[PDB]
Amino acid sequence: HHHHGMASMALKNKVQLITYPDSLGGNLKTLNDVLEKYFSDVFGGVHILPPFPSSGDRGFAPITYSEIEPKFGTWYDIKKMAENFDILLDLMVNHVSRRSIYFQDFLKKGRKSEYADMFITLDKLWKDGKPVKGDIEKMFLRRTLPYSTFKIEETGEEEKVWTTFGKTDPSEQIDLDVNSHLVREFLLEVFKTFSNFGVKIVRLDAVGYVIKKIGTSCFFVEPEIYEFLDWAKGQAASYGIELLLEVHSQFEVQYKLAERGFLIYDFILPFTVLYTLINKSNEMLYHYLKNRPINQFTMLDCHDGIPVKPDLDGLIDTKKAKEVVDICVQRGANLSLIYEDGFDVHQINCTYYSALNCDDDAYLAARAIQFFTPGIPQVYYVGLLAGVNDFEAVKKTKEGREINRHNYGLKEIEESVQKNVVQRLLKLIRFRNEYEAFNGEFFIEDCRKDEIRLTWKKDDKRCSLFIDLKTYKTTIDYINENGEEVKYLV
């Protein structure tokens, strides 16, 4: 029922960092050093993108969760960080590396492997294990074919298993059968491992894909998906873990998840803030702020691109979606597509600072809007350092999403944090962490279309954001410790 289990939910309301384990100095030890040097009271939590040994997709093809990738560090590095920050880690509920012991044993022994049932051999979907084109055509495909062919060593036979994702063929990412008792035991063991080292929040990667059903899109298949979500939520709670679901879908799916008591990502705000600032109009933002669940993790940038379709379906027309997309692409962006007909832009791959034309004032305005929006605010490491599009990584790797995944060395971090725009952002972050009003009541204030006025109130504390969208001048009027109203020019 409504907001099930949320009576006990009380998350720390402080800004969090999103980073790769190696993108701030090269490993978890340099990450910890950088956090201690510059950011101890800047972040209340850290989402470390997948730090387990992985065979592809920069961490999202995990081989095992029982150790941290040794290039990055050890589980004790995570435990030490958890002493100072809330740690958020990924659970790849949908797939595991083909190089895991589970799948390599299966490729050796075929059906006599004790792990065979962990994987979606095609006989679980079709009587004879033969794919049917008409059925595939109904599916939401994320690669040309949603399966891969492997050779069973002991029999020499060819076997197909489901692989939703994978840039190589065969894919490195083998889908898990979440109906298998063996998979549920496997996932439970990861929760236990995570909990053992202090992890408090777990992101369910690609959770929308876990239910396969012939005749459906195989994306967020109801009601089956909710049986898995309910199971996973209760087991995670047994180990002290809250689940954060990652679902790129139409807003009705996200809203129903929140209505049913699941934490979600705010995948509408990133585009909404871009549109607000590019067009100097608060109308879309105000409509969204008045009609959205508040128990969301907010972001501008993350490790993926800025969502467009399906996340904004029914909320913006193609004209305005294309306006913002085209402007971002003129500013260096590349696009991830749904994959010939219609508007098919899935995400805008672009640093958020570059998307705003490197306009410091507009970028600080964007973060102020984010931090004044109800929800737990997350700052991606590239945006923390006001990073611009990494064209070298795009040209060298031919991977568009690497535009927003630059790896910073220590010396480059030392230089970047001294930039005026970064120092302004750090001051704003600390204000959002320190000022008590953000833990109180939220009010959307009347104002002109080219203004933004948002207020938080708690006890004698109150802070009121004002943005002039004509100039992007961003001011916060707040009550200081002596009860005096003070003006903070962001």
128 is catalytic: no
Residue matched to tokens 């910073």 = 408
Determine whether the annotation assigns residue 344 to a binding site: yes
Confirm if 375 and 339 have CB atoms less than 8 A apart: no
Torsion of CA 113, 115, 118, 121, to 10 degrees: -10
From the list 424, 440, 310, 277, the residue with the least C-alpha distance to 364 is: 424
Taking the CB of residue 242, how many other CB atoms lie within 10 A of it? 18
**446 in a labelled binding site:** no
Contact 438, 456 (CB under 8 A): yes
Active-site annotation holds for 459: no
Q: Which amino acid is at 27?
A: N
| 346 in a known ligand binding site | yes
The label of the residue with tokens 């047994």 reads 238
Catalytic site residue from 246, 266, 361, 402:
246
Q: Using alpha carbons, list the distances in angstroms from residue 386 to 178, 354, 367, 420.
A: 40, 8, 12, 10
Is 184 among the annotated ligand-binding positions? no
- Annotated ligand binding at 345? The verdict is yes
Q: Any bridge partners for residue 204, and if so which?
A: 91, 245
- Say if residues 259 and 2 touch (Cβ distance below 8 Å): yes
248 known ligand binder: no
Please indicate if the annotation marks 58 as binding a ligand.
Answer: no
301 among annotated binding-site residues: no
Token pair, residue 482, equals 């002596």
Backbone angles phi, psi at 345, to 5 degrees: -85, 115
Catalytic residue, chosen from 172, 205, 311, 390, is 205
**Binding site annotation covers 57?**
yes
Q: What is the residue-wise DSSP string for 365-422?
A: HHHHHHHHSSSEEEEEHHHHTTPPP-HHHHHHH--GGGGG-PPBPHHHHHHHTTSHHH
Strand pairing report for 147-151 and 158-162: antiparallel
- End-to-end alpha-carbon separation of the chain, Å? 42
> Is 317 assigned to a binding site?
no
- Residue 90's DSSP bridge partners are 203
Q: Give CA separation, 390 vs 304, 328, 398, in Å.
A: 14, 14, 12
CA distance 489 to 437: 18
Q: Describe the crossing of helices 318-330 and 269-279 by its angle, rounded to 10 degrees.
A: 80
Go through the chain and tell me how many residues it has: 490
304 annotated among ligand-binding-site residues: yes
Does the annotation place 2 within a ligand binding site?
Answer: no
Q: Is 205 annotated as a binding residue?
A: yes
In the annotated binding site for sucrose 6(F)-phosphate, the residues are 57, 95, 203-205, 246, 303-304, 344-347, 401
* Binding-site residues from annotation: 57, 95, 203-205, 246, 303-304, 344-347, 401
Tell me which residues are annotated as active site.
205, 246
